[PDB]
Write a protein that binds this ligand. Sequence first.
Ligand SMILES: [Mg+2]
Lengths: 48, 45, 53, 47, 267
Amino acid sequence: QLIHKDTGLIKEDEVFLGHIPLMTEDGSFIINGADRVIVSQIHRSPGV
Amino acid sequence: DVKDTSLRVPPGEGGIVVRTVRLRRGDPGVELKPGVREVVRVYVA
Amino acid sequence: EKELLEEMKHPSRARRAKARKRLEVVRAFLDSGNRPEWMILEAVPVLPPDLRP
Amino acid sequence: KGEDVPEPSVPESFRVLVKELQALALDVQTLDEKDNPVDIFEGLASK
Amino acid sequence: TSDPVRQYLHEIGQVPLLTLEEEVELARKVEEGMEAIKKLSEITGLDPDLIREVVRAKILGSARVLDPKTVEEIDQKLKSLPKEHKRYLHIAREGEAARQHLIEANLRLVVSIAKKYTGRGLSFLDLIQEGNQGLIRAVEKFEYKRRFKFSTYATWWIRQAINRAIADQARTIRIPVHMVETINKLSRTARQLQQELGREPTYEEIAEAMGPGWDAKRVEETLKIAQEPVSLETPIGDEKDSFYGDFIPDEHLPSPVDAATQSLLSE
DNA sequence: CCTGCATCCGAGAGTTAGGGAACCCAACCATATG
DNA sequence: CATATGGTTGGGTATAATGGGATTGTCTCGGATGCAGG
Ligand SMILES: [Mg+2]
């Protein structure tokens, strides 16, 4: 929604943003026709 | 006025041709790179 | 070079070392025949295209 | 042809090295026993 | 020490801004100096560009490097005119000084404008330098008699200079300005038709949306000519050992087999 | 004035294989065609 | 050799606008060097 602070008029619109890849049932992705796996990353936890 | 640019079996390979796929410009869902008219894939077992 | 050679008579060792180090460069330039001002570029050479294809 | 291979020449990587050293404003020269210049480029780079 | 952006920002910030009075005065002095220089040129009969150059060189001083002989001779001849004319020369000097002061004071608008063009093939400092060129153009062409503020006229020229520099220097293979504009229009139209269609449009859609004189083959050729070259040093693999150019064979030099065939054929 | 003492910066860190974002308007040389 | 077409290039827009955007888990070693004491 586009809201004018002064007038108060509203302009509601649904916009297409692109595509999001979908995970298959077995847990992989099909990127450019090729099967790919995202590997989990171990790192230092945030905090004090 | 033309020469050979054919696809041949590399050394140490070969077998039985089991599957052929052809993708041309304009085919639904096909996205070739600009300038490439068509692509041919051969699956050999 | 003459100033540095006289500088090499000081009792201090660090000062003598500095004079010797400066003299290395001065004498290298004097013997080689290279001019110091050549260390500043005016014309930049351009590599042949086949080596930057 | 059945003969034995001839004697080799300067590899092209040394010519590439000389050209890349010239691009850094360094004059690399090959000399003979009497300190005269020896042209390893066969004359293709001399004006 | 490092980070030249900080150094340039500090050097521009060392010059105070201007008020309306100072700006209008500087514009008046530049305009009357240009009028005075053309009057001198008419009186002496020489080329106006040359007297402009000698006046500017004498103002800039020895510090800034036509040789000194001609500048001195023409200056002394210029310092020989009778009264009611050398006054023009003085006004020209003051106008040139006013032009310098105006550019020096308004440099910051160039940075403010150029800071919103990053990420388009030109570094920050290059955009600032081209904006400075546009600012020089605007200063030279500015007409204060219209009572309008200088920045309103300067912004257009700064943007024009930045856009022209981006169109001229952003690509390794130079594409003319009209063709670059055509590519930008193609991209915009394709983006809007992508959003509208909820998917990437086919080339016929873009050709239809550009207008008459556009077919799918032309769209394909235009996108092909818009391709940028890749680096021969693009790293392949995680280890720092394989480059893209390592996989490209040389097709120019004849192979040993080909040379042997030619030699045997000659024999 | 000398000296020592942390301090900063720069240069190293095995081989082979496989891998891959403004728009418009008008003049002017270049090239194509006869 | 003589044009005629597109492609290319230079010039122009007038409310007012005035200082940017990232930074992060190695380890040792050797020389250059600024700072402290005597
Ligand atoms: Mg390797």
